[PDB]
Structure formats: C-alpha cells, structure tokens
C-alpha cells in the first residue's frame, strides 16, 4: 500500500523561504514521477511542480517557475519542495502526488499547510 507523508509547513512571512518534505513508502520511489499540488483557501487545486523518476527533468507553472524548486533523494525515498520569496498567494495546503501510467495524480499525501501572513 502506497503512503505519502508531507512535512515542513507552518506559519511564515512573505519574502521568506521554506522547504517541504514528503516521505514515501509502499512502492519503489525511483520508478515514478512525483508531483506537488496545492489547494488554496478557496478550495482551488493548482499543480505546482513535477519531477521525473531520477530527477532528470522538472517542470513548473509560470506562477512558481522562478521561485519553487522540486527535488528528490531516491536513496531516502523523499520528495522536496524548496519555496523562496514567499508570497501571500502561496498560502495553501501542499500535497505530494505519485503518478501511475498516464494518470498524473494517482496517489496523494495527507497535505501540509503553509500559511503566509500579511
């Protein structure tokens, strides 16, 4: 059974940085694409970042492209999301998701909330 566990959220300030982690288990981490998807207070879902099996390719929406960095350490079975120059608009619940074939978000984590206040 697949398990994804996020960590690292909390109350932060605009301009700061924060790094989120997602501990994976129940599957061979290195054999799958991993993603980060967030849900804002208004309930809207937003894809935030994607990384390939061995970390060779990464893609982001133009909304976070120059501020967020997705990375992974396959030896630790962990996915990361480095967030810099935090904006109020970054306030949301962040989820890590694992794909399956052509399906992007086949498996989701529990989510960690990042609250940016101003």
């Amino acid at each position: 059974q697949v398990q994804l566990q996020e960590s690292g959220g909390g109350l932060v300030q605009p301009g700061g940085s924060l790094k989120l982690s997602c501990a994976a288990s129940g599957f061979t981490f290195r054999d799958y694409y991993m993603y980060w998807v967030r849900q804002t207070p208004e309930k809207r879902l937003e894809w935030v970042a994607f990384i390939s099996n061995g970390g060779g390719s990464t893609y982001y929406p133009d909304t976070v492209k120059g501020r967020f960095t997705i990375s992974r350490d396959n030896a630790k079975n962990t996915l990361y999301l480095q967030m810099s120059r935090l904006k109020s608009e970054d306030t949301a619940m962040y989820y890590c998701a694992r794909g399956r074939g052509y399906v992007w978000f086949a498996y989701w984590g529990q989510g960690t909330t990042v609250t940016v206040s101003s």
Binding site: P61, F105, A106, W108, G111
Partner: protein
C-alpha cells in the same frame, strides 16, 4: 485557452442518481480528463480517467456506482445510488504539453451534498 467549466453544486437524496459535468474549452474538446473526489478535510482521491469517446478506467477503491461518459466537449461523472460517503467536491483536471512544457488545469470543482 485551456479551461474546464464544471456544473453547479447540488444536493441528492440517498439512493438517487447524480450526473456531473466538466466542459473542456472548445479548442480542446477531444482531450482526456481526470476526475478527483475530495471528501471533507481529506486528501483528494483519484476517481477516473475519461476519454473523448466516454471510455474510462477508475481508480482503486472506486465503487461500480461511478461511471463516465462524453458528449463533445462535455465529460460526465455519473454517480448511481448515492451513498453518504459520496458527499464531496468533485474536481476534474486535464494535462497538456503546450509549448514543450507541462500544463495542468483543474476545474472549480463541484460540491455534491447528500
């Protein structure tokens, strides 16, 4: 101009039948979408992948009461014999590689109350 417009939130009485709509933007009427279900305070859950011909494959733990069909730019999620556990927000999403770069749009979501 990739957008997904979803039908309005509605309530259904246990045992009833529900049909939800997710409309693709005209230029992408032949796209394959994904349906996600999110129950109160819980993580979204993968429901199904739905193609232009209405064919689909559901996720694990999905009751046979959930089916999909299509009609042009419309993508439908049909919930048969509505149960309590079905109360949730249903969001559709669609991926695409526009300018050699990933893109993924979600719909506003539709809340189903029982």
């Amino acid at each position: 101009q990739l957008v997904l417009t979803q039908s309005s939130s509605a309530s259904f009485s246990l045992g009833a039948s529900a049909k939800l709509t997710c409309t693709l933007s005209s230029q992408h009427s032949t796209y394959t979408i994904e349906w996600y279900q999110q129950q109160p305070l819980k993580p979204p859950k993968y429901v199904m992948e739905l193609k232009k011909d209405g064919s689909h494959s559901t996720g694990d733990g999905i009751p046979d009461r959930f089916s999909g069909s299509s009609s042009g730019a419309d993508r439908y999620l049909s919930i048969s014999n509505i149960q309590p556990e079905d109360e949730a927000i249903y969001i559709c999403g669609v991926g695409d590689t526009i300018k050699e770069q990933f893109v993924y749009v979600f719909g506003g979501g539709t809340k189903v109350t029982v």
